[PDB]
């Protein structure tokens, strides 16, 4: 149960579960039930399935990009009416610009993919960025992110 260091392919059952991938490149699948999914070090692909699911960092380096390669995580499909994403351990100095440690959101030309970018360079020049593939951008809501409370204006 759960993953270990190295690459893993993990598939969850119908009941609610807590699943961590550990280090390495992992795929996590949650299935039905409300699930907790920890990506761990390395780039990961997280699939929540039915139920309210929370996707979390386990390390401060859990999702970053560099010229040495991308180590960011991707969440698949995503239910914006129910699911939660926590990014607090990476840290961001702002939520509305997209450069120098401030977040912004971007979309693919067909809206089928969504990206969270920051171009962080606080000291190490390592940008902390995430992506969502297959995302229901058509029904996305600000409630999904840890900061929440983003009223329109």
Positions that interact with Ca ion (CB under 5 A)? 3, 8, 12, 17, 21-22, 24, 26, 30-31, 33, 35, 39-40, 42, 44, 48-49, 51, 53, 62, 73, 79, 83
Task: Give the residue from 131, 126, 113 showing the smallest Cα distance to 44.
Answer: 131
Between CA 86 and CA 70 the distance in angstroms is: 19
Task: Give the residue from 86, 88, 120, 125 showing the smallest Cα distance to 104.
Answer: 120
The distance of closest approach from Cβ of residue 145 to Ca ion in the complex, given in angstroms and rounded to an integer, is: 15
Q: Which is nearer to Ca ion, 44 or 129 (CB)?
A: 44
Q: Which is nearer to Ca ion, 52 or 142 (CB)?
A: 52
Q: List strand residue ranges (DSSP E) for 35-118, in order.
A: 36-38, 44-47, 54-56, 65-66, 69-70, 74-76, 84-85, 104-107, 113-117
Q: Which residue is nearest to Ca ion (CB)?
A: 39
Q: Which is nearer to Ca ion, 18 or 108 (CB)?
A: 18
Q: Which is nearer to Ca ion, 43 or 103 (CB)?
A: 43
The distance of closest approach from Cβ of residue 109 to Ca ion in the complex, given in angstroms and rounded to an integer, is: 26
């Amino acid at each position: 149960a759960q993953g270990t260091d190295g690459n893993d392919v993990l598939i969850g059952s119908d009941v609610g579960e807590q699943i961590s991938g550990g280090a390495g490149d992992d795929r996590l699948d949650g299935g039905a039930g409300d699930d907790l999914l920890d990506g761990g070090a390395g780039r990961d692909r997280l699939t929540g399935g039915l139920g309210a699911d929370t996707f979390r960092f386990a390390l401060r380096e859990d999702s970053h990009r560099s010229p040495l390669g991308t180590f960011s995580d991707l969440i698949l499909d995503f239910d914006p009416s129910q699911d939660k994403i926590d990014v607090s351990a990476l840290g961001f100095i702002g939520l509305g610009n997209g450069y120098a440690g401030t977040l912004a959101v971007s979309l693919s030309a067909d809206g089928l993919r969504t990206y969270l970018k920051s171009y962080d360079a606080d000291a190490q020049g390592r940008s902390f960025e995430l992506a969502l593939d297959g995302n229901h951008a058509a029904t996305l809501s600000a409630g999904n992110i840890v900061f929440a409370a983003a009223t329109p204006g």
